[PDB]
């Protein structure tokens with residue numbers, strides 16, 4: 745009602761974010777191969793697989809914890825990448841999608 | 853050497869407040885104009901409050917400043933529809949903000 749309604753709603757939102765066509769940069773921990781020096785620059789890495797695990801592990805006891813993890817994915821992307829890069833574009837597209845899903849669910 | 857941070861922050865904040873897309877963010881959101889804003893947004897922020905905080909010597913680190921200004925954008929994006937003028941302004945100004953922060957070496 746309180747606790748497991750939240751779990752179901754977050755799982756649904758997170759699964760929908762993950763299936764979106766712009767989610768592909770964010771699906772797994774950034775690979776050093778593909779961004780040597782990423783981990784020198786970004787101090788709190790986050791990605792959607794880590795979020796899936798956190799969710800499964802019952803970490804997301806509130807809306808604000810879930811929002812902070814997902815928002816971190818986007819702020820990492822915008823800190824690391826130039827504004828006209830495909831990655832930055834994907835972040836803003838997926839963020840719009842995310843907020844519509846949050847609103848659609850009445851999450852508060 | 854001593855007031856270097858203050859000077860950098862003041863310059864960044866001044867440029868952000870002068871930008872043509874800053875107008876939605878210049879002052880606190882009024883309840884009369886935004887139904888249930890303060891039910892949904894728990895950490896309101898605006899650029900007049902940031903100006904005060906800065907004058908008040910609250911911004912003792914780059915991280916405190918970046919968190920406030922990022923909050924201005926994320927509040928807007930959560931609350932408003934994704935094709936609204938406000939949402940468009942927020943992302944424009946957010947791109948501007950990340951470029952100014954990078955330009956000043958305050959991250960990377």
Ligand SMILES: Cc1nn(-c2ccccc2)nc1C(N)=O
Nearest residue numbers: 875876877881885886928931938
């Ligand atoms: C809502 C909203 N309303 N306003 C607003 C700004 C200026 C004049 C009148 C209203 N800003 C926002 C915002 N930044 O979310």
